[PDB]
């Protein structure tokens, strides 16, 4: 491939990525309609450190590698049959939506109550800041994205539960649960992080019961089970804190394009938006006002990104499905479709804007359709 | 006028500005109790570039004019007979005064509700961040004051409808609705902003139903019509999220100090004080604690601000009557009145502070008269 | 006047401030050739409040009056005469250009070598910062402009002598000069600031000697000494570290444009300019990059601004000559001048640019003509 | 390939990006020796949008890809034969390598005074801030690396000379060079940015003579003619203030690593190391101190970087030659070599700190050799 | 002692800290003329963590205890007799003062040249930012002052040889040499930061010679052995980049005040102090300008801070002598007398503002007396 667009751009005479201009069609050679400076909007987590531990990995996409997003940071968690995410918490909320496999999360509250529960492919979990939690893949193992919403996430953001006791006098802790110093000499000398462990047995085995009763809501929701809006070239699955009542620093949807289809011209206007590719390729031209467009391409991994209230579309340009989550650090979801908005305006009135007549007005839709 | 005040003070030897000094007779000649930095409290939309276009004009003071107020912005808008503001949205809220004519106004939220009514003078509208909207002035155009809150508030903060399309692909679009790009060859290449238009026919005849329902609560308020607060020097007129209820972020109060009167003195324990002067003639001193204050001079066009708490007073200097807004971001109004605090201790309480006897503390008043 | 300019714009329909309109007929009716959001550039001295003291009076305009100037803040002072503006001493340093009358000023520098001289209309002074000094004006008064090279100078900024004592134990005032508290009874319990005073005596008279010997170099210049740059409408008068020697962070010019003229099209490769209008009336177009330009009026007091690099003129719009400085934070004065560049390149080449011919490239002259 | 080493990691289960992931073997499976959070410390050109026009094209790397980067920014710039890079300016110096092709350069000082050159293949260039200047490729056409000393380098650091031209006032245009308005007509409406134009003739009727002098320094430098630095794997090109005069601002050194070979480990005691990769394929550990290390993969167009002091190495990891820049915003080029340093210390000092022999400290070397 | 002065203030009826009361005399009981916030000047190195090591001890005062002293930043460090200092580099240039003891230490170039040499008791070094330093306490230890050139001096500032080769992959380090990865197999896997070791032999010992020539100026300076400012109350010693050549970010002085007498009232023209107190006891009383002015108590270990202009003294409260140091960030030392001053002005102008008589300007002195 070579940047020309009809008489514009040239032949590349230096040494280059042939590779990545493959996956940028639209960055090499953008639309004729892409004009002024746009912050990056796209990075890869092919494109980050793979920390490797006996048990699974971790790599990060954050303000550090994609400067635009300032309040969602990502990690990419791989865990291998009974190996065990150490118990941690952090002061970031932490959303998450289980890609491969299945695993079972605990999490305590202020109160003393606990909660475990097991996900699985298409589910999700929300921990509340600064509660303490865990995750455990089961047999199949797990992969799966978690979002913080905090961009600088990094590691003064995760305390884990060994690292804590390894910092902390031997004397203290032996006074603070009442045993000897002897009792606790055998305690890890430093924190686990991720580390293998046999499969865990039956759910109803593991609910401990306490005297402080159960937790007042779920901390994990079944996304795939509630009926998504479907539209003819697709369907969205939405949520956020009126439906998955303790997610309310994130609300999310999970959408699906049909090759052909595109999700519609929109934009939003409570905040930003954070994408990750989960599967499939599309393109997005983000419309940042004042005559500024610039067009990204996204493919599997990738993460993507829309500030908030800017115009864009998600265009399926593959031959297979383009599966892809929007993510939003508020207690709602929401959204204004290009076409409903002038559907629901008198025709003369969008006439008079567009230049355009009754055979073009005639084709808007009052009922929003996500996915076209 | 020289800047002399008893033995204080001297005549100017330099050239200078006549004009802007009869203007400004207290800052020439400040009162004998000012003393201390203070920022500058004072800006006029005559000192501002004035945006013309084919229909009326735009001009607007923000915080890269007055860097006191870095949450609210303000534009001093007007249009011709049918004029039209193009259909637009932005990050921020907007709330406007009409002070000449009337215009009809659209919004459509984010459930696809319409919205579509006309606004007179002295009527208001707001429109929550990011829903978008659109003004047409009617048989006698219209000239108002919108403000925004966010101080930035500038050119990359509105997005035109035809901006966005001129900037998206032609073959998105056509997918986008369903059509050839033949059936949008004529849309604008450039966006309109405002535009000469026909003048509408009858609100009623523009209603459009939907299938999504009526918005929950109106985005237009009729203020004059509610029964003022009515003291001795004036009326105050109030509208915040309590009586307007979509009008969540800002907070208002239309002033009207008849000759010889002043708002008296008091401060606000929520927020700071944006303000226009819409006619008249005025001084204000904002007390700013350790002994800082200083004094202004405001007149018709005008934007003042009175930071958070800071104690104040408006007095009419003038022979007119003197009106003005007085524009919070918070979703109340609210102040402390110096009168009434006073009166609502024990009288040798105020008498132990103040030094002085029974007879100024017969004189306060328990009730709240916002302008003597 | 109406903000009207062919078939744009409208008559105001709303209160207005009409002498403001009249001062500034290229904001109210801007050029067809602006365009863009552009910060404020101008500000009056007379919508500033005027410290009056017995003796004279001191007025500034500093970053929080004129946000783009965070480098540079301007007072414009005046003394009776003998008064005297107290010793003291600032963070900042201090240029200064006298307008009217003359004053005697003293310094000493960290050596312990004293300066003391005589500055009449037209001469400047550059004080080091945190070099101690003093001004007082001789039998005609004074009124000058000063300059320091910090645009957030305010009353943190300067300390005076009796301010400075009054707040020091007695004891160790005492202690320090090796006197009694008695001795010292009478220091002022507040500081002076501006006081009255019997004129001086002659120069000569108030030189002192010490065994540190004479200042390097002097804290004075003669600007109007020196011969001018001298075009044909009008004259420019530089100081800057290459010639007034001490003045190391200041750079100033002294143009003087005749009715009719114009100061060229032209850009600074250094620093931001700060403007001072002196006397005569003018506009100028500041053109900041990517599509964006915006014009500004200015008159007698006004300070004016131009960022870093970017593309202007001013050009006067009087019946009388137009007197301006242009003040730089930088060792040197530089300037890049449109017509040299254009002229100090291949003919062809030029052309090719301006699609103009060889007669327009005939016009370009290789030697700088400041004023046209 | 797959993220696993050892006993740790495991397969990728879900949807990815292969070809990336072949291309960032030390990124997917880092050394073990890799710990702690450290910034991104790469970006590849291809992943930015490109800006296509009649003539070539222009792509960008800036602190808003490569966030790490603050004071240092950078654009791919390709010209067809004869293309002309329009007129213009900016706030940041430039410094350019000469990849690919010819082009001649222009630039016009503030003394009035012009310098014409021709650069080739491995020359350089630098204008310092603010200076006016204009590419024009050859018959080869050219394509070169621009780096600029901001970060924040965008679309408002730019001025072109048509820009300017168009937003400013047609009088005003004409006053300024004594003509009439009728004879400016045909100025373009709308910058050109770069344009197709016939090549120039030869570089000696080119030359411009005047008034003001020749300049004194050169704007471009041959880094290929002076002798580099010849270590066993490869060799040193050093381009700084010290030898290439006016390029006060960036240091810069072109090196070349045979296959087998790697520069150094070593360290800058100066400033930031910004790094283009010109061909080949390498690997980097950067050493951030307290335990935290991180390994990034490079190959051809890619953009590096080493925070200010933190130690590294590059090594050759493929089968061509390894080229790439080593950039520094500074007046000069320096570095500490690990083992220059250990050499010139006492043999049982280092052996004390290493815990190894004499064995170890007799291979030490007290000559710095670059590339080994 | 209890905060009771006159008629004002009370007795402490809640419980408190008598010790550290007694050594704030005049912080619980501050003069009269004391008024206004002012930021705190003061901190104990006793008030902070000790890292203790086997071979000594560092406790530090940064930014984050003294949020003031933002540009400096202090150690001090404690090595037993031949401890070692682990060889290691940082972003900041680093002073020191030996208080205690002797040391040699070792520097090598960015050109490879070396410089080994002993130090003792009133001896300093300077290192200039990122060239490669270690200490090794001689036979009788050594305990000394540390002073870096930036306030947010922490753990990432300082690389360590070991912590750079533990975490850089083996292959690249025996590459890197010409060795065998299991050649240094040995090579530590932790930092040493502070380790025992055996005496060093004689200096002449382990000078080591080499191809890169002697360094141009020593980075060690016998501050006792040149001749002092001497007082009649005291003494000043002053090492700046004019007499200790490579100091050119750090001045400093060691002053010695008797009992009964005190550093004269004075300010600094340049930058920020910052204050150690090595023995004895002091008040201070900082004019931070607007009648702004807070006393601070000191003694031995206390850090202290004189913001930038801000008129101060120091005065012995003790019976044994006072020695403390004046660090500044700059190039030179620079002070101006209050005393010199006014001894360099016309009488009567003195006269006028003090409002004293011929009895008083007789006492000044021509002459600068640091310490009275
Ligand atoms: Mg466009
Ligand atoms: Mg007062
Ligand atoms: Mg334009
Ligand atoms: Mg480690
Ligand atoms: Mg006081
Ligand atoms: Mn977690
Ligand atoms: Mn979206
Ligand atoms: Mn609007
Ligand atoms: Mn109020
Ligand atoms: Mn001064
Ligand atoms: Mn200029
Ligand atoms: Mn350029
Ligand atoms: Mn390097
Ligand atoms: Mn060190
Ligand atoms: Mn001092």
């Given at each position: 491939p070579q940047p020309i667009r009809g008489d514009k751009g040239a032949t590349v005479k230096i040494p280059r990525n042939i590779e990545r201009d493959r996956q940028n069609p639209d960055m090499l050679v953008?639309?004729?309609?892409?004009?002024?400076?746009?912050?990056?909007?796209?990075?890869?987590?092919?494109?980050?450190?793979?920390?490797?531990?006996?048990?699974?990995?971790?790599?990060?996409?954050?303000?550090?590698?994609?400067?635009?997003?300032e309040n969602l940071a990502s990690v990419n968690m791989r865990l291998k049959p009974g190996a065990i995410?150490?118990?941690?918490?952090?002061?970031?909320?932490?959303?998450?939506?289980?890609?491969?496999?299945?695993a079972r999360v605990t999490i305590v509250d202020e109160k003393?109550?606990?909660?475990?529960?097991?996900?699985?492919?298409?589910?999700?979990?929300?921990?509340?800041?600064?509660?303490?939690?865990?995750?455990?893949?089961?047999?199949?193992?797990?992969?799966?994205?978690?979002?913080?919403d905090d961009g600088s996430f990094s590691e003064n953001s995760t305390f884990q539960?060994?690292?804590?006791?390894?910092?902390?006098?031997?004397?203290?802790?032996?006074?603070?649960?009442?045993?000897?110093?002897?009792?606790?000499?055998?305690?890890?000398?430093?924190?686990?992080?991720?580390?293998?462990?046999?499969?865990?047995?039956?759910?109803?085995?593991?609910?401990?019961e306490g005297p402080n009763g159960e937790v007042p809501?779920?901390?994990?929701?079944?996304?795939?089970?509630?009926?998504?809006?479907?539209?003819?070239?697709?369907?969205?699955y939405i949520a956020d804190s009126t439906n998955f009542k303790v997610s309310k620093t994130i609300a999310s949807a999970l959408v699906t394009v049909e090759p052909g289809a595109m999700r519609e011209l929109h934009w939003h206007p409570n905040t930003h938006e954070w994408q990750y590719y989960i599967s499939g390729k599309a393109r997005m031209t983000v419309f940042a006002s004042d005559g500024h467009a610039r067009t990204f391409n996204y493919q599997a991994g990738?993460?993507?990104?829309?500030?908030?209230?800017?115009?864009?579309?998600?265009?399926?340009?593959?031959?297979?499905?383009?599966?892809?989550?929007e993510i939003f650090k508020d207690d709602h979801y929401a959204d204004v479709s290009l076409n409903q908005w002038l559907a629901m305006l008198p025709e003369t009135f969008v006439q008079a804007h567009l230049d355009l007549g009754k055979d073009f007005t005639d084709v808007l839709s009052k009922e929003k359709h996500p996915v076209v």
């Amino acid at each position: 491939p070579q940047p020309i667009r009809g008489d514009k751009g040239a032949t590349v005479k230096i040494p280059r990525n042939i590779e990545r201009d493959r996956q940028n069609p639209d960055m090499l050679v953008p639309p004729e309609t892409d004009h002024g400076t746009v912050s990056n909007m796209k990075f890869s987590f092919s494109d980050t450190h793979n920390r490797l531990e006996k048990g699974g990995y971790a790599r990060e996409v954050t303000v550090r590698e994609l400067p635009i997003s300032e309040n969602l940071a990502s990690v990419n968690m791989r865990l291998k049959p009974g190996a065990i995410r150490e118990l941690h918490w952090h002061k970031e909320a932490e959303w998450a939506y289980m890609i491969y496999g299945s695993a079972r999360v605990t999490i305590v509250d202020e109160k003393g109550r606990s909660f475990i529960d097991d996900v699985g492919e298409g589910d999700l979990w929300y921990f509340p800041s600064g509660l303490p939690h865990s995750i455990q893949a089961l047999e199949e193992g797990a992969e799966f994205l978690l979002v913080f919403d905090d961009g600088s996430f990094s590691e003064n953001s995760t305390f884990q539960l060994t690292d804590w006791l390894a910092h902390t006098p031997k004397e203290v802790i032996a006074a603070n649960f009442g045993v000897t110093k002897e009792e606790i000499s055998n305690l890890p000398g430093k924190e686990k992080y991720i580390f293998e462990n046999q499969l865990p047995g039956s759910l109803k085995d593991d609910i401990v019961e306490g005297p402080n009763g159960e937790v007042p809501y779920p901390f994990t929701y079944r996304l795939l089970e509630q009926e998504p809006i479907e539209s003819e070239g697709g369907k969205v699955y939405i949520a956020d804190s009126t439906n998955f009542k303790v997610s309310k620093t994130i609300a999310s949807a999970l959408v699906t394009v049909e090759p052909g289809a595109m999700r519609e011209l929109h934009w939003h206007p409570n905040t930003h938006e954070w994408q990750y590719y989960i599967s499939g390729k599309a393109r997005m031209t983000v419309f940042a006002s004042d005559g500024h467009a610039r067009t990204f391409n996204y493919q599997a991994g990738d993460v993507g990104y829309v500030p908030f209230a800017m115009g864009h579309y998600v265009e399926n340009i593959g031959d297979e499905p383009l599966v892809f989550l929007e993510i939003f650090k508020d207690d709602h979801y929401a959204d204004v479709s290009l076409n409903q908005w002038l559907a629901m305006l008198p025709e003369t009135f969008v006439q008079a804007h567009l230049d355009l007549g009754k055979d073009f007005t005639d084709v808007l839709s009052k009922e929003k359709h996500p996915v076209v």
